[PDB]
Design a protein around this nucleic acid. Sequence first.
RNA 1: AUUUAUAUACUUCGGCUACGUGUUC
Length: 252
Amino acid sequence: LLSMDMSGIQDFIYNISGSKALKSLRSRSFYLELMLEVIVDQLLERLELARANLLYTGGGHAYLLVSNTDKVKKKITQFNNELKKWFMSEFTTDLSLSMAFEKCSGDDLMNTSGNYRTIWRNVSSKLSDIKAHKYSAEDILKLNHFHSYGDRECKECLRSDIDINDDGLCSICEGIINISNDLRDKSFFVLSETGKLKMPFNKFISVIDYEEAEMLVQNNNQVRIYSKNKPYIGIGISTNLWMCDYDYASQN
RNA sequence: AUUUAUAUACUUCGGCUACGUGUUC
Ligand SMILES: Nc1ncnc2c1ncn2[C@@H]1O[C@H](COP(=O)(O)OP(=O)(O)OP(=O)(O)O)[C@@H](O)[C@H]1O
């Protein structure tokens, strides 16, 4: 039973002070949500496994029931290592993820003597105490010695480490603005290798409509269409992602 | 030269901080 926790959502989502703030917030919550979705899907691809194995997602949590094999464990550990590398490379304190798992048996799941709750609490506890130790030695040394030439804080996004560009905006928040602009009109989001917004596994997210999504399907491209609460799509890798995106300002 | 001594009605009714504008280089 594998559990994942996102570290810093309540902080990173609430460093917004600009005039376009509302557009980013819809884009920022969606950005974290899509991060979690793409990372969990990518994990399930590593496990050569099915989507039905995801028991619960939401907030910064995720719950999976995967095979108890040494192979599974080595893959989980390796992907955790690469994952931690990537987040350290992009935000380094604002967002982190945690991995944890604890053995369970069939007798446990069948609700024999309430041990289901015992294992649930055990996995929660291991997830919540592995967050104490997040950084090995060499990583913490690696952070502290970068006399690296960089620019200053993003206006929309409060971050010293980030480097601003045109109009005093960094790349990440400008892409956030663009995808926010596209949010209200277009309903489908694609996982593509060129795209707009930087995403974990060397991937990028852009926006599509059902027709060019269809062409992408007949383009046999390794794509995952992520939708805005649309059933009956039947387009490639159908992913009716569950999200509430409402704005009265678009009713004018 | 011998009785009043101000009396009742109404004791303010009608009509209820706008703009430049919030954030950064
Ligand atoms: N994409 C998101 N955008 C905005 N708020 C979110 C998003 N995802 C989750 N949240 C909410 O923000 C809350 C605060 O997140 P927080 O940073 O405290 O991390 P967490 O997931 O609760 O875990 P922990 O605090 O143990 O690290 C979450 O509990 C959740 O309800």
